[PDB]
Design a binder for this molecule. Structure first.
Ligand code: HEM
Ligand code: HEM
Lengths: 137, 137
């Protein structure tokens, strides 16, 4: 289920983080604009970039922490606030977060693994509602 | 579902509040110790006590608001905080609340209405979880 999924992703965090983030960037090309050093690079080129692996891993590490702290897939208000006031997110709207989770859910469904995709869909929706109440447009 | 259940209970609150609270007290006789004037009385006698109906209704008026304010059966941290800080609850532990929901879920399953008993069970567990986080033993 949801808790096992967190253990699965953490077990090979580097791999899952890179593949899911690329799935996100290629599904929503407009999103790459927020990350100027990823522009004009193929998937393999990015997988070779030290900063790419490190950053994506850090993004997913925090996502897993938030997911582990949640109750019945509902994130803590404090975690939502933390994501909203991070300077790196100053610019962002809930729309950007919805797209990430759509790509994440689609990735899980398309993989071979037995992820609890329904819970992740729920988690993403609840997280987006939480960002909204936290003041994100 | 859960949201419709809130509307159903609100539509005949006094009746539902008394029957469920009576179900609670009769399943757990020991819990009546927290309510001084309820010992040694039959159900019909309690229902004729103005104080019994007035307080049970107020208890359910608030319970429905907490449920209404919840996201995915997960109550707001602030509502959990209010329940723990209420002076009338200074001597309670999460066990008392757990028993109340066991009785409430049993009541719904035994009735003939189409209540979403599974959701109320989840709500009860998540609320107990929230009470513990708010400092309740
Ligand atoms: C709830 C999901 C998300 C989490 C947990 C998260 C987490 C993080 C973290 C921890 C960092 C700092 C990285 C470091 O330490 O170097 C970061 C940076 C950043 N995030 Fe997020 N993020 C999320 C969603 C998003 C979304 C949806 C966007 C926009 C499509 C976004 C855009 C950025 C950008 C532009 C940076 C700075 C760029 C960089 O580090 O190269 N993030 N994020
Ligand atoms: C989350 C479920 C609960 C809610 C929303 C709730 C709500 C309330 C409210 C609003 C009052 C004040 C009523 C007034 O104005 O007189 C009250 C009083 C009280 N509650 Fe609770 N309560 C809950 C659970 C419990 C439990 C599980 C117990 C322990 C069996 C309990 C014991 C009491 C007592 C002893 C009083 C004061 C005695 C009395 O009013 O006659 N409550 N509660």
């Amino acid at each position: 289920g949801f808790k096992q999924d967190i253990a699965t992703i953490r077990g090979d965090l580097r791999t899952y983080a890179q593949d899911i983030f690329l799935a996100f960037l290629n599904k929503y090309p407009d999103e790459r604009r927020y990350f100027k050093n990823y522009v004009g690079k193929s998937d393999q080129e990015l997988k070779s970039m030290a900063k790419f692996g490190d950053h994506t891993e850090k993004v997913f590490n925090l996502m897993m922490e938030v997911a582990d702290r949640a109750t019945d897939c509902v994130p803590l208000a404090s975690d939502a606030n933390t994501l909203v006031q991070m300077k790196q997110h100053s610019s962002l709207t809930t729309g950007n977060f919805e797209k990430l989770f759509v790509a994440l859910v689609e990735y899980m469904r398309a993989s071979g693994q037995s992820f609890d995709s329904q819970s992740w869909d729920r988690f993403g929706k609840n997280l987006v509602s939480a960002l909204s109440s936290a003041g994100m447009k």
